[PDB]
Symmetry: D2
Subunit: 488 residues, 4 copies
């Protein structure tokens, strides 16, 4: 075990006053990684009062002073990339080959990006007439809250905290109870970089208690949430009933990958693989509906199976391991229920469909890489997000058909097309109802690129210049230099 | 008495299938203006299918073709200004001296503004490397819904529909049951201007039925709401619980007007009057907490009393009338309950405080212009929005005190300061927690100026370039021209 | 009667005592005698512009927007009348002038009218006690100098952003094509533009154009024309009074036909890239690079399409090819055609004046195509500004990029290919400001256009050009106590 | 005396091939600081070919890779601040109290600012119709040239090279022959930070030879020039005659300082001192026309005299020295001719008017702090930039007059007003024809704030986001996905 994990409030670790704890499990072994204290209602109020004090100090600094502090945190994150990745691997089950290459690297990339943009955050000036003009300030919201998910814990903490801090706010962050550990490390790193006390506080806890207290607190101006649709609805509802808050939500999806009639099938299979089996399928943007032309289906299926042969499950710290267990045993039970529904509805199982067995697997939350084919639009595994390593392959005949079927979903997060044809690529992409679209690739999410969902996949965006601005609020100021006229 | 008012769906009036109606009255006389049909659940669904069909036509046109149609609607609104003002006066009770100068004029100003901006709505292009780049599209949300309030019915309809339509969306608009008539005229005007059938549908009805159906419909992408906090919470809950929707809300406030120690008291009194008694106090941005230095309070009160004597209640179509009844008898009752709480909590009644009586008043929802003084921060009339003609005068001593008291509220809509001093004006305004700030004036809301609330006074903004962008959704598109690498 | 100057909302006699003649290039007859603005006329126009600019800038943004939109409405109403005049003055067929010249000029005015209210400064917080805000102020009086190939379009593309940004503009049309600019000045006044905000000074470049470039109270010059005159303008502006200068100077733009291109599509693009306005378009794709394996078939497709060109009565619905703008310009184009023959280019079609009844009296040059061209030929290196296409064989993609870029010009370029990677990959490597994929010639009001290298300075159209007609004033408000070290 | 200084081309010092040298003088002693090689026509061509090669390497890197390299150069500049400040003091005569606090600090501030903005440099995307769209790229110009002035040598070098490099260009920089030394140090620092060889080359030389060779070279795409009007005309002419190049110029001015009738005269005097005698009056933005109300003129003069009496001329490396000699003895001769013209034209000499004398001054190019009063608008010292420590005080009666007289100049660089009144401050500033305006202050030039001249004081701007964009050129790209129609 690790030492008991405490709350992080005002630049130090502190015990919760709730009397409550929870355990985070190592999904490779089933053993308790750490006992973690859960923030109660009083702890949340302490954190808000801490955040209000730190935010004022932070906002009073110059823009470049803030930039330098966030840049110092970047420098530390680069220095400690491997240490943090190992902790993320223990907490999440994702292979070290992923966490050491992606999770901290791309989280720190977004922090570095926003650090450089702070001096460029500007309001406007609007002349009305010789005797009057308007100017605007992009002011901090104040205290904002982030609620993270368990698939990319520190990356999510960085993608929410970076624009929030760069915009002059304090953020209170609640990591998922499944994966609370790296967020506490991030808090220490920020303070070491010189972040003022209270500007980034971390409250581990359960969604139903700590998360609810955050969403209900009257002095929190904005909630940013990553997770599933079901929890998103609770968060949105509670934020409205209790105290009005701006809200950002990234909620996953059922993203379609469209393989065109002129696609190279090796390229198409490589993209489909990376869109389904990275992080053991636990990625919001995964292309879990793979639409393949009927004329290519059989050959595509054989290419996918060949690549499934390249998946290497094993020791998560071994260099050649590229597939992990799922994040938790309850999550695995849910994925197995989806797989069983696929079988009972007649989807054709090409590989996988069961847990992994044997030495080194019996005690971990492993699900084999699973591919179904001959899938149809009404199947449960086609309609619902599984968030495991389960690819659904669907045949199609014509371009208008596949666009309709790709869009006939309540989800809207990502989409992609594989085609060498100029007109086909742009023409199809422009008709797809998704916020993140990839042409002849999958998964790259540059700091510069706004990402978020259409329809039930989200509200608002993350990354890009617009997200820095979305963590400010506009104040419009009219200077009236002429004589004021009253009609009374 | 007008003919029975029908729903407006797909470029024509159509009967509701709900079997339900309501009546709108003239609040100055109690006479029934019209029987109005109320949209049922099936009517809403028909309106959404109409909007989906029209939106596709509208979005496929060129940007300048859309601009020209909205400009033609501006032209018609200018020509019919006085006619529409008369109807608005009948429906709302606001004096014709206001409705003919403000309501349609500023609503049409915003439509005119956005009409010219359609061709400037652009995405971005982000170079990643020689072999890859990103571009973004600002795509229409699709079908959006607007929910109006009764204090500025046609202006609210124009401020919501103008950016929504200019961004390429269709809007379904539900006016308040208290004041449904001008929204129906607006629907006819848009069709006359060449707006494609279905792009602006109008569904009169009750909030508890028609409004809820709109917030719950799965194919509406965004709700924009103007009204009170209680109804906003209901709207937010239903919009999230049913189908995730973007949400904008303007919810009123308790805005402070700060008279500085160096202010001219004639200017201060004129601003305070215009900040409290325009539209009979039924304005979201009204400066209903008037902070006056103790050394000036008695003279300030005398100047307010002089100006209150100039308030001219009477025939709403007479040019010199500058004060009307409240919009409804239920609303006047709420204002009267607040007046009674002010008296019972020890506030000093400076003037007013009762219903108006006599010929021309007995049948209308008239309340005398009312001023309380000797107020303290804990009184109900100081803490809560009244939305009638009730000014609360508070004394203060020093600048730090007045800033703290001005900000000690859950609301955040507007604020203002009266001072000739350069440093004092900008220094105080920058510390106030409000989205709309006026220096040496009150009430002007240019089309260019984003307006909306901090804290519990709202979510999002209206007007300005940013609100056009807020009625689009960003699609990010990565073009990968290099070879894609899979780790499988 | 002589056509007069337009100063302060009325036609007024020049004080120069000087005139020139504009010719109808289809007949050689004098279309009109036009007065030429002298140095005193320029000074009068500047004082008029200074007075009108102050009125115009004091109006609200939306008031300015409405006035420019009224001018758009008048241009739409008078489209056909103005097009007939442009045809008389320029020789371009009415099928062109009535479809493009006023239509696209008015498109740009309409665009900027709607963008005026969006012209905003910025606000920068420095610290609690100080902030900066900026204003985008008008330059004041600006000058535009037009060319003869698109006279009223050029007047509108220059005046629209200048006026929308709150400036007055003094506009000098080319002496070859002065008439439509004078009609535009009347239309602006009719729309409610304040007197002096748009003045028109016909004259010669060597006199009126020089006087404008030298005047001390003109804040900016925007110039369209040739490189030779562009240097003269730049030289005179430097000697006299510091001014911002924007320039669009033509080019030798390459059209790259890829190995996977459909040759009917490529030939159609090549035709529109070379023979619209009788080849008198700055952005024309006059170096057509064709894969060697496609060359013979492409040449046949070009020969078929060139043979179908309908030269004739400029007001006839089916005419799609006109004479050149002037007889001196025709002589210059014929010298280039002769250099192509004498330097060993193979003449595929055309190469001479058109002859016979209906052509003998006009400045006609046949649509002309050379092939077997090489990069050292004069017709390949120098802008001809007539209907002269140069077809060049190439073997490899890297080769054609080198050759496309091996020019001092940089105005436009294009590629014909159905391949996603090829289209973007090639375009990103071309050194040109205006790039077309599987098309040619469309110039949306939203799209900034201008040249790399010797093809220009600055841009026209797009939001950025509205801003380029303002100057930034930065204003710091210091609310804290100022510290002096003395 | 230092070693002979070489050219800096392609990441190393290299001998000039011109066979020519020049000397830079220490203006405090008259001694030769160094012999410096002068770049010839062949040396410029070699530097251009070096720059073309390095620029391609630099532009091919990621935006953030470039950001990190420029940030490393910032880090080195901070560490070497005192070393560089001392060299600048020796070369320019400016007190170390200035060079160690302002010159490198604000030069590095601008580099740090642009380093963070590189990832935010974006093109646009414009939808035309379903079958066609436009996108733009902001491409590097290629090789650009900067020509520096002698009053702020390393700051000018940083203010030009920072946006040029951040936009992806290589820059060839020619420092003034009076002050060539710190630009050579900067070149070494860029290489140490990882700037690719050739991206920043430095060519000392004479304006008439090296500068002209740069302005004439056919493969240089843009010239950025700081200096006087006379040389700016030479640069403009030669740049046009040779090869069309974008040219940016900052050319000094005769900037007005307007003291309002309600101004505190101690504040006004302090502002006037800082606007005239910093860097011994050798500042482009100096407020050398000080407009004072007639009723306050005598008292203002008495306040200026006391403050002039506190000026501490002496050892330039002593902490309490705040006034230095002029940059050169030829420049002093020109300033003394202006002073004599003031005397002969009837201006009243309030103080100074001569060189400083005595031990420690006889060998330096010192001019006493000089104030003229009773000045008139036709006087030479009022109309022409002196670039020495010479203040002209002009009386005025009313606001409309002083605005007219402030604007009655061919120059337009800066301006300021001193007033506590809100309306007066904004009203006056909005009417002044200058690009840089200060209210109740003088001299601060934040990296965020675009700076440059109206009228004869310059073309284009420096600093601010816009200057980064001005070092790119726009490429517009239309994608036509529909069938192209030819009319032939
Ligand atoms: N970029 C383009 O779209 C464009 C347009 C036309 C021509 N060109 C090229 O230019 C070549 C020469 O044609 P051109 O000589 O008729 O055109 P040009 O001289 O470049 O005409 C451009 C404009 O500059 C004016 N101008 C001439 N000398 C001037 C001076 N010293 N100061 C100020 N303004 C001056 C001209 O006045 P006047 O015409 O009254 O003398 C005209 O208004 C053509 O063969 C073609 O290659 C390019
Ligand atoms: N705007 C400012 O901040 C500033 C700065 C300094 C001076 N000035 C003004 O300029 C006046 C004259 O001083 P100055 O003559 O020493 O300054 P200057 O000539 O304007 O110096 C500016 C720069 O231009 C270079 N230069 C000169 N002639 C050139 C040419 N033909 N082509 C290219 N580059 C050329 C100079 O090189 P060399 O020095 O090697 O000859 C120097 O690097 C001063 O009295 C003052 O009013 C203004
Ligand atoms: Na865990
Ligand atoms: Na003519």
């Amino acid at each position: 075990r690790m030492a008991e994990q405490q709350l992080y409030i005002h630049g130090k670790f502190v015990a919760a006053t709730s009397g409550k704890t929870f355990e985070t499990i190592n999904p490779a072994t089933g053993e308790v990684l750490a006992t973690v204290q859960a923030a109660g209602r009083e702890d949340v109020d302490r954190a808000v009062k801490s955040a209000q004090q730190g935010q004022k100090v932070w906002a009073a600094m110059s823009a470049m002073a803030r930039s330098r502090i966030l840049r110092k945190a970047v420098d530390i994150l680069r220095e400690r990339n491997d240490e943090l990745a190992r902790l993320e691997t223990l907490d999440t089950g994702k292979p070290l080959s992923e966490t050491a290459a992606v999770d901290i690297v791309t989280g720190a990339d977004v922090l570095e990006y926003y650090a450089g943009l702070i001096p460029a955050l500007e309001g406007s000036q609007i002349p009305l007439r010789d005797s009057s003009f308007v100017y605007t300030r992009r002011e901090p919201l104040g205290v904002v809250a982030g609620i993270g998910a368990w698939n990319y814990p520190i990356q999510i903490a960085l993608w929410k905290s970076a624009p929030a801090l760069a915009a002059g706010n304090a953020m209170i962050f609640k990591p998922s109870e499944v994966t609370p550990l790296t967020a506490l490390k991030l808090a220490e790193i920020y303070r070491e970089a010189g972040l003022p006390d209270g500007v980034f506080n971390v409250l581990p806890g359960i969604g139903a208690e700590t998360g609810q207290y955050l969403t209900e607190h009257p002095d929190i101006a904005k909630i940013s949430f990553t997770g599933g649709v079901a929890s998103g609805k609770k968060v949105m509802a509670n934020s409205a009933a209790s105290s009005l808050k701006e809200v950002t939500m990234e909620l996953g999806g059922k993203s379609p990958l469209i393989i065109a009639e002129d696609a190279n099938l090796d390229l198409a299979a490589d993209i489909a693989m990376m869109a389904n089996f990275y992080s053991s399928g636990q990625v919001c943007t995964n292309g879990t509906r793979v639409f393949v032309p009927a004329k290519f289906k059989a050959e595509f299926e054989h290419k996918i199976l060949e690549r499934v042969g390249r998946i290497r499950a094993g020791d998560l710290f071994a260099d050649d391991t590229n597939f992990g267990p799922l994040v938790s045993f309850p999550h695995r039970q849910n994925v197995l229920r989806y797989i069983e529904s696929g079988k009972s509805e007649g989807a054709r199982l090409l590989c996988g469909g069961d847990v992994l067995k044997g030495e080194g697997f019996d005690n971990g939350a492993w699900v084999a890489p699973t591919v179904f084919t001959d899938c149809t639009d009404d199947m449960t595994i086609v309609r619902e997000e599984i968030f495991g390593p389960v690819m659904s392959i669907l045949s199609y005949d014509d371009e208008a058909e596949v666009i309709r079927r790709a869009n006939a979903t309540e989800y809207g997060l990502a989409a992609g097309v594989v085609t060498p044809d100029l007109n086909r690529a742009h023409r199809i992409i422009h008709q797809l109802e998704a916020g993140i679209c990839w042409i002849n690739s999958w998964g790259e999410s540059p700091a510069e690129m706004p990402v978020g969902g259409y329809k039930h996949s989200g509200i608002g965006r993350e990354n890009g210049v617009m997200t820095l601005q979305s963590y400010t609020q506009v104040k419009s100021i009219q200077v009236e230099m002429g004589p004021f006229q009253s009609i009374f």
